[PDB]
């Protein structure tokens, strides 16, 4: 019969086709696809971020005591392993006099010694580095900086959000309307450079990280530099990422050892911290917990090889609520010739000092808005069924109530 | 056994109600997603470039009459009308002032801050040591004056009065705009004490913006320092965002013909200041009278310092739907080289010390000949709604829209 | 059944919308970032802004190229302008005396190589992930700035280097001496003459040549410059959805090819930075033919040679930061260490520090917005909604359209 052939001829193609296309939409769904929704929304306020900054130098040269030098000199490249000064013809005369004086161990009774105490006491004091401080055109004081220990030593966090302190906000973008600090980096307190190590800088300045209050600073890896002699502008953009969990993504939605709120920085410090305690029964200045802080012998012999080997293991995925701060750096010179003499008079320093040691850091929001980056689900379940039902109710006539009629037969 | 059957219709009917209502809610969220694209081009329209010298008024162009009317405002006179004892700056300046600042037998003359701003301001004619666009030279006539919160400022390629807008045909260092600026530090007003308005900075402020929007360079600027050639690698972005209900965008288009966040902020900030003090600042549009130095101290500084905190929503300025943004990557090298310092001093009758204190080279260009497009697309249209519910009907039931119409009888 | 005519019209309406939408070939974008344990480090190409060393310029160099280089006026003599330091003006006034001189052959590629800055003397210090490296890790490549060097070229069978940690130390950390004293003196102005001093750096995939005259950034002396990178994997869509195109293709290699086919066709000449086997331009040929020939291409024949984007692309985003060099504590030491003045150090030394912010890579991918499977579901659902229709019912109406 020609018709009931041409009929079932092209109907069998149509059932193979529905079988084909319906398999495509079930395979796609099981890839669990997502797409991205970029949006920007206007705002009237914006919570100002946390700002963590460090002097590139860890210990003030003048704050080193005789006791400090006995224990830490070989650690700091100020004594060779026989405990005396190299007398290298590279030196400041006055500093090498100060050192050999403090480094003469005749009839010396070693005293107790601790690395947090050294870091805390020898570290640069915000009270003397913070020549000037203004937030939204109102004044601020070293009280507004919370101390934090990083691999760069005693560092400070503005608007840290801790100890019941509210988070600062801003109501206008641009230079005057955020944080504007004038720092004095104190170059002549830098520990001298007579030979080289992994831990030696020719660098001079500060290191800065702008980060949310829910995450600690990781300023040795996430920092940026600000150099002396310039007022450096930091124009920021608030980005609110909302990312998708598994199966759609690799997000971490949950709660999270030594911290309470999960964040990639907080996670990487745990892997670093437990590894060092497990392999050396020891922690470093930047690590949380209760372990004893490392001794100079323990660092030379144990912790440095333990970290050196650790890199050559621990994966830390992104959280689902993440607020990031994008920034555009720009800079102009300080001081102007007109203000150079005044700044020296104002702070009892020479004009040469001001241009070698003064930086102004100026952090603000470009404008009152925040960008939103959200992974959205591409193929929900409701949309699959509409797609199959439409494909069924097209290639054939079936409903799901029909396919159940085929069981009422058998 | 047909109670298993009408149980199995009542269930499958409930499932259609649930899944179909989900797509009705989703549709009512008015969802959108984003389409990133990059498209090649053979030419590319060059932006406007607005720049300001960080100093507002040239020290040498300040007259006796200026000092009488604006001297206390500018931290050049204490409220007794004299140099403030401290006098912490070099004699030749302070000598220049002690003569200009002697009001014995002085007859005050009229004064206007815009006239002062225009007249004392840095002149593009002395600032612009050199200028090249697409390797061809340019002159101060290609820069148009605009008054900003920084004063008398200059915009390259302003696009106004029927002048064609420049284009570019190649990316990289030379193939856009390269200026050598003299910021003229020896003209900066002295600093003897501090004010809200006093800076230790020296250099220029630059904003790269489309010609459809005015410069708001005291917020949207960036700094360029003297002593460097500063490279500005730009990427053109044409973002097209969606109106309500999908977004919060503005397609509608007072003080300006074309909507822009900047035009809205300057407009709102202007209406506020005129309402509360009958007074506008130099950077503001319109026809209101310009603030006098007394009106600033007595009215506008407090009026603005109060709008900084207790206000905000007098204007939320929403984004327009068709927006061109310029991304910029800043880089720099030192100018001048040891070989070219001596040549540069000779060229401009200036000291070698001066050049390293006052010369900057600004280099604005496109990374490459293309533009990115960031585009909001609707995720769930009405046509796709019907396809989704119709299929669920034609799946859980055999139902059509006509079938549900028979059930009303 | 009266208003059936309406519901059929609505099916025509909605079905035309989703059928036209399909043919726009819509795509939307999928942003994701995925964590990694290792990460392949890029190539880094850098140039001294200065092309030829003053000390390596010979009398023969000066005869053929002195006018090309604004070192001689078109009478072949020194401008004798005292606008440069005496020792160098004496060095050149000497080299420029053409009494009894037999000119010898000369080609521009040799000059670029020999007078160009030598990688062995610029590279004061080199560390990759804290381990030492040597000028042997730098492959020479010729760009418009002359003899330039590419670290981790990935060429000559060397495996591609990786890094396992982010931050300051764990990338490439070179300390350069830009050698301000070998910069050619500047006596007058040219298209090709600079007041600048420092280097130009480009971070690129090993699969593409550097286009450092267009895509570089500047590094200045007197600073350690921090370069924080983020690896981006772009996967973009071919036609009809997009305009991407699927030794190795790259946008850079496409432009350098258009630039070379054009210059050889019109001047039978190639420039130092160009690939192939054509002869290199003589100073007169550049003067007489190529300089106007390239000038013309930018204005009229960019439009004829169009270069589309590739479909698998790895980009490197960079954030520049800097701190001062050298510190007062280390200023005296670096002078002693390299037998140079403290003022020389602050005028000639930069430390370039390239690294990844952290161990992850972003992926920006164009995805198809409306495929064919999803079209049918939408129209099929619309058919089974406004009417009862399947495709079979439409075949009954063509059966019945056999009466
Ligand atoms: C308990 O916590 C810790 C204990 C020991 C640690 O090990 C070291 C810390 C610092 C240095 C070091 N800092 C220098 C600065 C300048 C110079 C210079 N001469 N320019 C030389 C320096 N050496 C060396 C080893 C680390 C810890 O926390 C990370
Ligand atoms: C009609 O429009 C306006 C009227 C008044 C305005 O008020 C002021 C404008 C400028 C200053 C100011 N700029 C200084 C720079 C350097 C120094 C220094 N001593 N170095 C001191 C300065 N004082 C102060 C007040 C503003 C207006 O429009 C914005
Ligand atoms: C076959 O390959 C080529 C041949 C010729 C080319 O043309 C020129 C190459 C270099 C210069 C040039 N470099 C200078 C550096 C310093 C100074 C200074 N006075 N300080 C002046 C300089 N002039 C000019 C023209 C280009 C080629 O390939 C790109
Ligand atoms: C966190 O995630 C929740 C999930 O619903 C979301 O509503 C909220 O906006 C996110 N942000 C904060 C700061 O809680
Ligand atoms: C965007 O702007 C251009 C010119 O301003 C105009 O031609 C175009 O129609 C506008 N709309 C879109 C969606 O591009
Ligand atoms: C390139 O695209 C292909 C898709 O066919 C993919 O398999 C591959 O991982 C991509 N990346 C590279 C580096 O080739
Ligand atoms: Na659908």
Residue numbers in the entry:
A (entry chain B): 41 to 296, 299 to 354, 359 to 456
B (entry chain A): 43 to 295, 299 to 454
C (entry chain C): 48 to 293, 302 to 458
Give the article text.
Acid-sensing ion channels (ASICs) are proton-gated cation channels widely expressed in nervous systems. ASIC1a can be activated at near neutral pH and can proceed to desensitize from either closed/pre-open or open channels in a pH-dependent manner (closed-state and open-state desensitization, respectively).
The crystal of the ΔASIC1/JNJ-799760 complex is grown at pH 7.5 and diffracted to 3.0 Å resolution. It belongs to the P212121 space group and contains a ΔASIC1 trimer and three JNJ-799760 molecules (one per subunit chain) in the asymmetric unit. The JNJ-799760-binding site maps to the finger and thumb domains within each subunit, at the edge of the acidic pocket and surrounded by α3, α5, portions of β2–α1, α1–α2 and α4–α5 linkers, and the acidic loop before β6. JNJ-799760 makes extensive hydrophobic interactions with L115, L116, M155, L231, P232, M326, V327, and Y341, forms π–π interactions with the aromatic rings of F99 and Y159, as well as hydrogen bonds with the carboxyl side chains of E98, the backbone carbonyls of L116, L231, and P232, and the backbone nitrogen of V327. First, the acidic pocket of ΔASIC1/JNJ-799760 adopts an expanded conformation, as evidenced by the outward pivots/shifts of the thumb helices α4 (up to 2.6 Å) and α5 (up to 5.3 Å) away from the channel core and the acidic loop and by the increased distances between the side chains of acidic pairs, D238–D350 and E239–D346, in the acidic pocket. Fourth, the second transmembrane domain (TM2) helix of ΔASIC1/JNJ–799760 undergoes a (TM2b) domain swap that allows the Gly443–Ala444–Ser445 motif (a.k.a. the GAS belt) to adopt an extended conformation, as that adopted by closed-state structures.
